[PDB]
Amino acid sequence: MDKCKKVYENYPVSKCQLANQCNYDCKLKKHARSGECFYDEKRNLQCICDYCEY
């Protein structure tokens, strides 16, 4: 379900504990439109940036 949603590579995932932090870093640093932390198929938390949805 790709191309809109990209993984923030090398993101320190402790920061997913901070409210809105992945969102914030995705917008300001990756110049994406939003971001949220999700678990991947290896059951690891990831910050995922979204360059389409706000």
- What is the total count of domains within the chain? 1
Q: How was this structure determined?
A: X-ray
- Residue 28 identity (one-letter amino acid): L
d(CA 49, CA 54): 10
Contact indicator for 45, 35 with CB cutoff of 8 Å: no
Q: Which helix (H) or strand (E) holds 49?
A: strand 45-50
Q: To what resolution in angstroms was this structure determined?
A: 1.5
DSSP labels for 8-43? -TT--GGGGGSTTHHHHHHHHTT--SEEEEEE-TTS
Q: What's the domain range around 5?
A: 1-54
